[PDB]
Design a protein around this ligand. Structure first.
Ligand SMILES: CCCCCCCCCCC[C@@H](O)CC(=O)N[C@H]1[C@@H](OP(=O)(O)O)O[C@H](CO)[C@@H](O)[C@@H]1OC(=O)C[C@H](O)CCCCCCCCCCC
Ligand SMILES: [Mn+2]
Ligand SMILES: [Mn+2]
Length: 239
């Protein structure tokens, strides 16, 4: 089986999630064919040079999975788009582009974080385009770590404030964008996160039955999608 997770938002002061993730790696990822992490692995990323001890332990635990023969892949989220090649090497992860099609046991599946489908949120998409500019990223990364942490803290705070004022519609995926992505790639299956609204949605793409499977955020329990020859299963599991 091939596993998909997203939206862990790992951080020091959410220790149940950290413990749950370590257990997941040892008990589930170890026996899988591959693991895909579809963004927001960390609560925030302000550069691979961050000395946070959590990053060291998480990198080693992920690298132990891929060193055991189970490849680990990462699509960036909105929290952790700065995660780079240095941390990918430390963690034994392969970095993927923002959209990727997999063929799994004969089944073509599109994967992404999900935030690029939220096309009605013009304010977010504006922000996203700016912070994805390599020149601006490279400029941010030149600041002292403590300044980067203050910026991130402010961004987190203003994000929470902005979100409480936004309609549910602009913060969920746009259906035209969903269908457009699934027809661009001619898939009947899409797995994403970002919205923190776990569900299996039925829809039409390519004039055929299609499915959009949304991972849950990790808080008091975890969420994965398990893909086998015969099934695509959204599974919630306790810590
Ligand atoms: C150049 C390199 C910069 C590097 C920075 C590295 C640190 C990144 C830290 C993570 C920030 C991230 O949380 C912001 C974000 O993505 N918010 C969108 C997201 O909501 P979340 O709160 O993240 O769940 O998902 C929501 C649903 O899709 C969406 O609505 C939120 O988007 C917003 O709230 C964006 C607002 O519309 C505008 C953003 C205002 C940010 C304030 C900037 C303060 C910076 C000051 C520095 C001078
Ligand atoms: Mn998230
Ligand atoms: Mn997200």
């Amino acid at each position: 089986a091939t596993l998909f997770i997203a939206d862990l938002h790992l951080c020091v002061e959410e220790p149940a999630i950290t413990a749950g993730f370590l257990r997941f790696l040892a008990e589930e990822a170890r026996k899988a064919d591959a693991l895909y992490i579809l963004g927001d692995l960390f609560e925030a990323w302000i550069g691979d040079d961050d000395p946070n001890p959590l990053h060291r332990q998480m990198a080693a635990a992920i690298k132990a999975v891929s060193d055991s023969g189970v490849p680990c892949y990462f699509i960036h989220g909105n929290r952790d788009f700065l995660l780079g090649k240095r941390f990918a090497r430390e963690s034994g992860m392969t970095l993927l582009p923002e959209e990727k099609v997999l063929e799994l046991y004969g089944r073509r599946v599109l994967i992404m974080h999900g935030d690029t489908l939220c096309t009605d949120d013009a304010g977010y998409q504006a922000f996203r385009a700016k912070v994805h500019k390599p020149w601006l990223q490279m400029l941010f990364l030149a600041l002292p770590l403590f300044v980067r942490k203050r910026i991130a803290a402010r961004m987190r705070a203003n994000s929470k404030e902005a979100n409480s004022s936004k309609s549910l519609a602009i913060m969920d995926v746009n259906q035209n964008a969903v269908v457009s992505a699934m027809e661009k790639h001619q898939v009947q299956w899409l797995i994403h996160g970002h919205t923190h609204r776990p569900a299996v949605h039925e829809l039409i793409a390519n004039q055929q039955p299609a499915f959009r499977v949304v991972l849950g955020a990790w808080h008091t329990e975890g969420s994965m999608v398990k893909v086998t020859a015969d099934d695509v299963e959204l599974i919630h599991f306790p810590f």
